[PDB]
Amino acid sequence: GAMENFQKVEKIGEGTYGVVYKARNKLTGEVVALKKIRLPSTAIREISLLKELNHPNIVKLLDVIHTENKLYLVFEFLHQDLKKFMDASALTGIPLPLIKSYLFQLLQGLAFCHSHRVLHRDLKPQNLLINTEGAIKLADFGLARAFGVPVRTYTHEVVTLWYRAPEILLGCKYYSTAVDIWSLGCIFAEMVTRRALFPGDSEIDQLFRIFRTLGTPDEVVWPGVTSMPDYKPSFPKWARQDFSKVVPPLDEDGRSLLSQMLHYDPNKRISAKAALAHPFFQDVTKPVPHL
Numbered sequence: 661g662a663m664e665n666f667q668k669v670e671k672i673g674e675g676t677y678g679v680v681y682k683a684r685n686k687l688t689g690e691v692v693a694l695k696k697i698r699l700p701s702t703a704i705r706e707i708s709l710l711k712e713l714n715h716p717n718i719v720k721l722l723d724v725i726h727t728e729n730k731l732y733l734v735f736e737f738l739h740q741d742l743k744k745f746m747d748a749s750a751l752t753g754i755p756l757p758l759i760k761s762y763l764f765q766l767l768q769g770l771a772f773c774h775s776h777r778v779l780h781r782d783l784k785p786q787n788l789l790i791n792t793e794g795a796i797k798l799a800d801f802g803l804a805r806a807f808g809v810p811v812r813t814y815t816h817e818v819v820t821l822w823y824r825a826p827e828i829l830l831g832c833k834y835y836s837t838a839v840d841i842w843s844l845g846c847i848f849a850e851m852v853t854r855r856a857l858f859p860g861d862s863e864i865d866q867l868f869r870i871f872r873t874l875g876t877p878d879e880v881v882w883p884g885v886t887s888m889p890d891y892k893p894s895f896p897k898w899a900r901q902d903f904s905k906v907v908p909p910l911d912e913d914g915r916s917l918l919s920q921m922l923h924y925d926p927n928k929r930i931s932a933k934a935a936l937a938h939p940f941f942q943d944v945t946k947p948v949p950h951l
């Protein structure tokens with residue numbers, strides 16, 4: 661069949677929807693990352709369109725193969741993920757110029773996809789892939805619109821809530837591009853501090869962690885919040901903390917940017933385009949990482 665063209669080399673990992681292998685294309689000679697999803701007509705159309713969603717900071721979708729009750733997604737191969745790099749950099753920290761380069765690149769990736777009205781909806785360090793040159797790329801872009809974001813993965817692993825926007829947690833059915841800015845803000849904070857910003861272990865724990873740092877949202881900061889489906893007037897009313905406490909020793913340009921990425925109101929939250937123009941990026945460079 662179709663899959664006799666790919667030689668499996670090694671197992672990379674386990675995604676939300678299926679297993680990912682390093683593989684060799686026998687006809688072209690290319691080394692690829694092959695995602696195998698066990699199987700929907702609408703999903704096939706939506707995923708096939710992602711072959712056109714091409715940008716240097718988006719993991720290249722080389723092909724989509726629907727065969728034998730399975731969907732194979734053939735991706736470009738990269739060295740490792742940001743999670744491994746952050747774990748490896750725990751003692752010393754990722755240098756600020758490299759954090760800045762990576763955030764700048766990821767914002768370009770978001771600005772591109774958002775310009776075509778495609779959301780990621782499940783950004784997290786495991787979906788950010790790096791090479792030895794200094795590039796970083798977003799993996800799994802567009803798969804959430806095709807399949808949804810489940811509670812558990814295909815292996816029953818808990819899908820993390822740590823990067824989930826508060827509008828999603830409060831039960832908004834209609835997600836804007838702002839949900840990805842929220843997630844990337846949380847990732848930015850984690851790179852700087854070497855600890856997850858909001859490591860919640862349930863929906864309410866996630867919400868209350870957000871509230872304990874940013875203040876419990878009300879009608880002043882977020883018009884309509886008190887009418888949202890999963891909003892309860894019984895939520896405790898926590899005061900907002902200073903960003904100087906949350907992400908030390910990050911400078912005022914970095915804190916300004918982060919604060920705008922974590923605005924409660926999706927309509928007030930900074931866009932990817934606007935974030936690229938932020939003064940934080942005035943001295944941005946492209947360093948080569950220690951991998």
Ligand SMILES: OCc1ccn(-c2ccc(Nc3cc4nc(OC5CCNCC5)ccc4cn3)c(F)c2)n1
Nearest residue numbers: 675676693735736737738739740741744786787799
């Ligand atoms: O524990 C440390 C360790 C062990 C092995 N590695 C590791 C080896 C190779 C790669 N390269 C890679 C992986 C990809 N993965 C994709 O999909 C998954 C992304 C996350 N969400 C689920 C789907 C898509 C395209 C990919 C392209 N290259 C790597 F990233 C890590 N790291």
